[PDB]
Amino acid sequence: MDTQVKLAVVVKVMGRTGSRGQVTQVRVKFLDDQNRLIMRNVKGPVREGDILTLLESE
Amino acid sequence: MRAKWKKKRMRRLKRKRRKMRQRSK
Amino acid sequence: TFKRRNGGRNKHGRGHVKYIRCSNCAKCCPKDKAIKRFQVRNIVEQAAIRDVQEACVHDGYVLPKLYAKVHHCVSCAIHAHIVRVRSRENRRD
Amino acid sequence: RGAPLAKVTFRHPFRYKHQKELFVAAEGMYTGQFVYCGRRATLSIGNVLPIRSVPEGAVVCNVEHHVGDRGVFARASGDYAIVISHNPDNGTSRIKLPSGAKKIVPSSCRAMIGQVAGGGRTEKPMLKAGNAYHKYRVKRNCWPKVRGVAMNPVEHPHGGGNHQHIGHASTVRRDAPPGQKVGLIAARRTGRLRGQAAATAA
Amino acid sequence: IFASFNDTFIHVTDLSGRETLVRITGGMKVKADRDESSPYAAMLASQDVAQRCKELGITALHIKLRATGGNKTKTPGPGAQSALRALARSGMKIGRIEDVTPVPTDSTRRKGGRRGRRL
Amino acid sequence: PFAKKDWYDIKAPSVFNVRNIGKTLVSRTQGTKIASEGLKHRVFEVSLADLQNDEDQAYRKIRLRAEDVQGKNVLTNFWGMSFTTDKLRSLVKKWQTLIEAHVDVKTTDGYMLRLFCIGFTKRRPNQVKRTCYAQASQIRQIRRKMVEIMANQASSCDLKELVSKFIPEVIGKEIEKATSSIFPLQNVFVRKVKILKAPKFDLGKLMEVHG
Amino acid sequence: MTKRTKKAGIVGKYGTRYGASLRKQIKKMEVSQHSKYFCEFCGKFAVKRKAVGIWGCKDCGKVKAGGAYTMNTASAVTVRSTIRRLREQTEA
RNA sequence: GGUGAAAUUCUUGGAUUUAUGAAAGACGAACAACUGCGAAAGCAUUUGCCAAGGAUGUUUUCAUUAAUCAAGAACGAAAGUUGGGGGCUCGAAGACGAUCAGAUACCGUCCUAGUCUCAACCAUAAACGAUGCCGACCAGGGAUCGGCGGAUGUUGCUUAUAGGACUCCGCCGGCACCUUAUGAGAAAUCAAAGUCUUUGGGUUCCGGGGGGAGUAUGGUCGCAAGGCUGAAACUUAAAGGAAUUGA
């Protein structure tokens, strides 16, 4: 499953190892057409309000 | 009172080494 | 050794309480030396809250939280939870 | 059986009155105490009455394996059955036996309140061969046990051999015919560990 | 009218999870789980894998058979819990009420982690 | 199996809320081990939240067992009152007393019930203490009273009357008022109830509680 | 006392024979055979072992059922108590 | 099942799971606390009975009965055990899987004795407050446990009240904390480890370098395990403590 909407805002890092700088996935919601919860992958820390393109997303 | 593992080891060996002369081997 | 007014550790006219076993390892611990921590926490999440209530009957419900005291063997608490070490004065807290 | 039966004397006349003789002894019974035998009898030790009127969880001695056979379950000393279940069940009273088996038996069947007397009899040791002899003499048993190894090969399958030994496997089949069927007959296991009482489930 | 009550049960250990599509009496209509696919072990317990399991359940219950109201009930806590619960919305499943009732600790206190489980 | 399974819509009795309970599928009513006659006495739990509408009973599930079926519409009478775990887990917070009690009672015809009752000391104006404890033998005096009071209010005309008190939990609250003169009591609920020593079905009588 | 350390009964009977474990059980149950017991009926410390499982009080003449070696038994106490409790609650 | 990762092991002999009864045996979560009681070991469901013990109160009574102890006596966790009940759970040894050159273990899985109870043994624990018992004194403060006293306080509503829970202040006796410590101490710390160099309050026990050795030997005891009592040859200059500074 998963649609494909423009952008995506990270709701909050669901955990991982971490401490400072967060290598592993994060749970994201689509910025527009909200309330679709999936796990998309990032390297590095990330904040809510951040804008990143999730082009094909899935 | 009772001390430490020195007495623990030697307790086991106390009657064993008396009986290891009847046995020998 | 003795740096403590607390004697050995939580022993005040008792010596031995009545044992709980750790959630983590199941080692016996008397209750006052156990380490209990309130984990009153939602089932959902932050994000999850929204989704459930949209697709559910009744306005929000209440959401029926999970309540658990978590029992540690001392060692277990050090690795993640609340021990961490301290500075000398604040240890009397 | 080397254990007592209380002599209870019923004496009342008529002519066809039938009376007299030995009901099985229970603990705590005394001479000159009255014994009541029947349906609506009071609940006191030594009285015999149908099992239905006895409440659940109640220790009894003697039960009937169909009415009028007089005493079948628990009769050997210091043993007793405990009536495990009833409910309002017309058909069935369930009794946990001293074997540990849970038995369906009619609710009409009589049982006597209490445990049977003379308990502890077998527990403490004889400490003579001669004490053993006297008990077995009075009952139907021939006293000394000669081992199968000690017997000749003609007399016994385990006999014979230069040295002392049982020649073959002791365990023989249950289906095996008379003469063949020797040793530990149809043993579920052997060698010394971790069994239990008869354990039915319901 | 839609009387609409039908429980789904998720049987969880920390190590792995499986979903059993039960009902109000509790007899199962169907069950399914991952491990026919590639990830095995604590990668089932994993939240990404948990979503895959959840949807497989739901799809039978609604559209095909056609019960609509449903309780989610779970047994003790995994990492998977948030993912399963969130995805019930995207299953197009309507929660009649949600109650989790994993089984409480009551002093089933024995060394082999008999107590160690529970909640 | 799915293209053979029945549908039972399960009906509550009369004295109760909303008559609808749920939807099941079983497996076709095939001769010898029919799906109807077979089961029944399984358990149906629906929260009082989904029956009274309100969330002032957001917990409290009720165990109903089926005794009779009339053509794929399965009747039920009270065979218990249950509780969530989450309700006991909330309520029971640290630093305060428990007051515990158990009851066994039968009703007119001998349907067996087990009533419970738990209670905390209630906070008083001007408290400094983070604790506020009663004094144990004092607690015990309360406990003895609870059993008597519940029994007197109860054992009247079967399930029927008592059940309709249980749902808005009237019985519990009446206790608190009288008792408070000597010692508080907080909450006080029926909590759980199982039948485990039923009389007889008495199928005639059951249909009075059905319509 | 005389040439007696502990006591015997049956230790003296044996000679060298039988053994230390074996005498423990039987010493306890043979002292019980000898043992005077108080009657429920008269209250005197009369009662003596008539036979196996049979006890008789000499003075009042009352004959009583009991254990083989001993007047009563631990098992006997348990059995009577449960029966009396069940009788008491049901009769109510 | 299981875990970090796997496997032994269990799976149409449709497990796992699910519900309902019943049986069996165990245990009293959360509540349950720098809080209680009991000589101590130790002791948490309800209720009844039975005797018991401390604290407190007392213009009741006796009038020095007291204090503390070799000997001697009672009780004394666990394990092991003697015999029954009893064996649910778990679980030395063993037997299995990984890990491991070895792994006999941690870890996983099977599981016997045993765990439980009862009558018996036993006599030991970091059986600890590592701190003898008893008495008087030297220093401020707030909690909480128990009882008592004083309030035309609160709640209670008990007919009204008294009580009781709450708030209080005073107070006997507590478990202890807190902060300073006059003072002790080697320091860490400590209202006792103070009141021993200001050297001697009463009583008792023990140590008197480290190892050997808590063994050897003898006596004593124990059912057994083994305990209790307890050396010396010979070795050797430090063993040990607390704090401090490095790594």
Side-chain angles (χ1 to χ4, degrees), chain D residues 167-190:
Chain D
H168 192 61
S170 185
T171 184
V172 179
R173 210 172 188 90
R174 243 297 159 94
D175 300 296
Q180 183 60 236
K181 187 168 59 183
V182 296
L184 301 176
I185 314 171
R188 274 59 180 181
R189 65 175 307 286
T190 48

Side-chain angles (χ1 to χ4, degrees), chain E residues 17-88:
Chain E
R18 65 252 67 159
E19 171 168 49
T20 48
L21 185 60
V22 296
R23 56 199 161 113
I24 186 174
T25 60
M28 63 169 54
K29 307 184 188 299
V30 73
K31 52 178 171 62
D33 194 42
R34 211 97 288 101
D35 288 352
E36 38 69 63
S37 298
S38 195
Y40 181 72
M43 296 169 70
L44 172 44
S46 188
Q47 55 187 50
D48 291 71
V49 194
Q51 295 179 119
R52 310 175 188 157
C53 304
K54 188 63 180 180
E55 58 189 297
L56 247 294
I58 304 170
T59 193
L61 193 278
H62 69 296
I63 188 168
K64 308 185 182 63
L65 297 171
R66 204 170 296 277
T68 187
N71 283 37
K72 292 183 275 69
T73 299
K74 303 175 187 295
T75 206
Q81 188 171 69
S82 302
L84 295 164
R85 185 145 180 143
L87 207 74

Side-chain angles (χ1 to χ4, degrees), chain A residues 37-49:
Chain A
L37 276 56
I38 51 180
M39 303 83 196
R40 294 307 308 144
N41 36 262
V42 293
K43 194 173 183 180
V46 68
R47 286 69 52 191
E48 56 185 66

Side-chain angles (χ1 to χ4, degrees), chain E residues 23-25, chain F residues 8-13 21 24 26 35-45 62-70 72-80 111 159 195 198 201 203 206-207 210:
Chain E
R23 56 199 161 113
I24 186 174
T25 60
Chain F
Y8 297 95
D9 293 297
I10 309 93
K11 287 184 171 179
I21 291 179
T24 49
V26 183
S36 48
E37 306 186 302
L39 304 180
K40 305 196 186 188
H41 300 285
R42 308 189 72 178
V43 160
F44 304 98
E45 283 180 60
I62 295 179
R63 290 190 172 194
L64 299 172
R65 303 175 183 122
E67 290 173 289
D68 292 295
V69 177
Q70 298 185 118
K72 298 190 174 184
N73 291 299
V74 171
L75 304 171
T76 55
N77 290 298
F78 307 98
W79 275 88
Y111 296 98
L159 299 163
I195 309 184
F201 290 103
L203 301 171
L206 304 178
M207 298 306 302
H210 297 310

Side-chain angles (χ1 to χ4, degrees), chain B residues 5 7 10 15 17 20-21 25:
Chain B
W5 269 43
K7 299 183 179 178
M10 293 301 300
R15 274 60 170 86
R17 288 174 174 164
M20 203 61 171
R21 300 175 188 161
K25 71 281 185 178

Side-chain angles (χ1 to χ4, degrees), chain C residues 10-61:
Chain C
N10 298 80
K11 279 181 162 180
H12 303 294
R14 293 161 191 276
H16 303 273
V17 186
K18 235 160 281 166
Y19 298 77
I20 286 172
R21 279 186 160 104
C22 317
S23 56
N24 301 291
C25 302
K27 303 180 181 180
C28 299
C29 294
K31 308 204 175 192
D32 298 299
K33 307 177 211 174
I35 307 174
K36 294 187 182 63
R37 297 176 67 253
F38 286 70
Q39 293 190 354
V40 182
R41 297 180 181 180
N42 293 283
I43 308 175
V44 276
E45 204 193 300
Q46 295 181 354
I49 307 173
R50 310 172 189 138
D51 304 293
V52 177
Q53 296 176 341
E54 288 169 62
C56 277
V57 186
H58 304 286
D59 298 298
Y61 298 118

Side-chain angles (χ1 to χ4, degrees), chain F residues 86-136:
Chain F
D86 307 300
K87 186 165 178 181
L88 300 169
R89 290 175 181 163
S90 51
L91 299 177
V92 183
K93 295 185 177 181
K94 207 173 182 181
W95 314 116
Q96 294 186 298
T97 57
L98 294 176
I99 302 171
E100 299 178 295
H102 311 300
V103 184
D104 299 300
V105 279
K106 289 188 173 184
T107 53
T108 52
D109 302 298
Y111 296 98
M112 193 268 177
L113 305 170
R114 300 188 183 238
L115 309 169
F116 302 100
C117 280
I118 303 173
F120 302 81
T121 48
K122 282 186 166 180
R123 300 196 177 276
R124 297 294 192 153
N126 303 312
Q127 286 176 347
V128 170
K129 285 175 179 179
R130 298 182 179 181
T131 42
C132 309
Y133 292 128
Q135 307 187 347

